[PDB]
Amino acid sequence: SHKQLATEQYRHVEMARELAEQSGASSDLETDHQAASDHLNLV
Amino acid sequence: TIEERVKKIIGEQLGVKQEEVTNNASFVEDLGADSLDTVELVMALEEEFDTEIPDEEAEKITTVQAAIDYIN
Amino acid sequence: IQSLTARAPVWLAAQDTLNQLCEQSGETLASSNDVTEYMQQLLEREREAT
Amino acid sequence: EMENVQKKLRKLERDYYQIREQVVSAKAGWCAVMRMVKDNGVERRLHRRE
């Protein structure tokens, strides 16, 4: 169980990292879509 | 020196004295310690040094000298 | 393992009695036929000593 | 959850530590008894392997 927990910790960290990147991407997309809503209202 | 630990513990675990053990011999058959006795010896060595030895490495102590080789 | 475990104690008791018996004698037994032939030698010694 | 299992590992480790002291201390006495018993008792009289 000790070695299993070490391995599981490593994998868990990897998944957390890729989700952090997607969170940043989501904020960027929100910026772009705010601009998009403004454009719709302008048209 | 620090080896006095091993060369002491071995005897205390096998009934032989400090000088009885010979580096050329093997615990499994040349000291009379069977499977259970050798498990007890390796596990007592583990206890004394407050460390850990997995099964694979632990199985490589059949000879007298090995008890110090992994230690020092 | 269950079969062997059930069988073991009987075999061990039998072996202790056998070792005691043959050690009590000068000759060491190894088989049923061997025990029988030892019976016969014992009878011959009876009928000479008598 | 996995951090709490790690703390389980620590608790189990100290349990193992306790068991280990038990084992080594027991052997220390086994040594002495089997030293003294070699006055022919262990041969078959005390060692009732049945």
Q: Containing H/E element for C24?
A: helix C2-24
Nearest to B67 by CA among B7, B1, B2: B7
Using a CB–CB cut-off of 8 Å, the residues of D that contact C are 44, 49-50
Query: Quick check: A1 and D5 CB within 8 A?
Result: yes
Q: How many CB atoms lie within 10 A of CB A3?
A: 8
Q: Calculate how close chain D gets to A12, using CA atoms only, in Å.
A: 10
Distance CA B9, CA C23 (A): 39
> Does A6 touch chain D if contact means CB atoms closer than 8 Å?
no
- Cβ neighbours of residue B22 closer than 8 Å, sequence gap 6 or more: B30, B64
Those of residues 1-40 in B touching chain D at CB distance below 8 A are: 12-13, 15, 40
Mind giving me the DSSP string for D1-50? -HHHHHHHHHHHHHHHHHHHHHHHHHHHHHHHHHHHTTTTHHHHTS----
| CB pair distance less than 8 Å for B46 and D20 | yes
CA distances from B5 to B12, B19, C47 (A): 10, 13, 67
Q: Which residue of A has its CA nearest to D13?
A: A2
Amino acid of residue B59? E
Distances (CA, A) of B43 to B38, B59, B67: 8, 11, 12
Tell me whether residues D2 and A12 touch, CB distance under 8 A: yes
Classify B26 as helix, strand or coil: strand
Alpha helices in B1-72 (DSSP H): 3-14, 27-30, 35-48, 55-58, 66-69
Of B12, B13, B47, the CB nearest to D21: B47
At C9, list the tokens.
Answer: 């104690």
> Nearest-CA neighbor of B67 among B29, B36, B22?
B22
Q: Three-state DSSP class for B24?
A: coil
CA distance B70 to B68: 6
Within 13 Å of residue B70, how many CA atoms lie on the same side as its CB? Answer: 20
Sign of CA dihedral D23, B69, B28, D37: negative
In one-letter notation, the amino acid at residue C27 is: E
Q: How would you label C2-16 residue by residue, b for 16+ Cβ within 10 Å and e otherwise? A: eeeeeeeeeeeeeee
Subunit contact A1:D9, Cβ cutoff 8 A: yes
| Domains of chain B, each with CATH number or no CATH | 1-72 (1.10.1200.10)
Token pair 């079969």 is found at: C3
**CB interface of D with A, residues 11-30, below 8 Å:** 12
Tokens representing residue B61 in the block = 């102590």
Give me the residue label for tokens 């037994």: C29
To the query of whether residue B55 is one of the catalytic residues in this protein, the response is: no
Q: How far is A8 from A6, CA to CA, in rounded Å? A: 5
What is the spatial distance between Cα B12 and Cα B48, in angstroms, rounded to a whole number?
Answer: 12
- Among candidate residues B66, B62, B60, B68, the one with its CA nearest the CA of residue B26: B62
CB contact under 8 A, D49 and C9: no
Burial category of D47 from C-beta neighbours within 10 Å (exposed 0-12, middle 13-18, buried 19 and up): exposed
- CA B7 and chain centroid, separation: 8
Question: What sign results for the dihedral spanned by CA atoms B22, B26, B32, B34?
Answer: positive
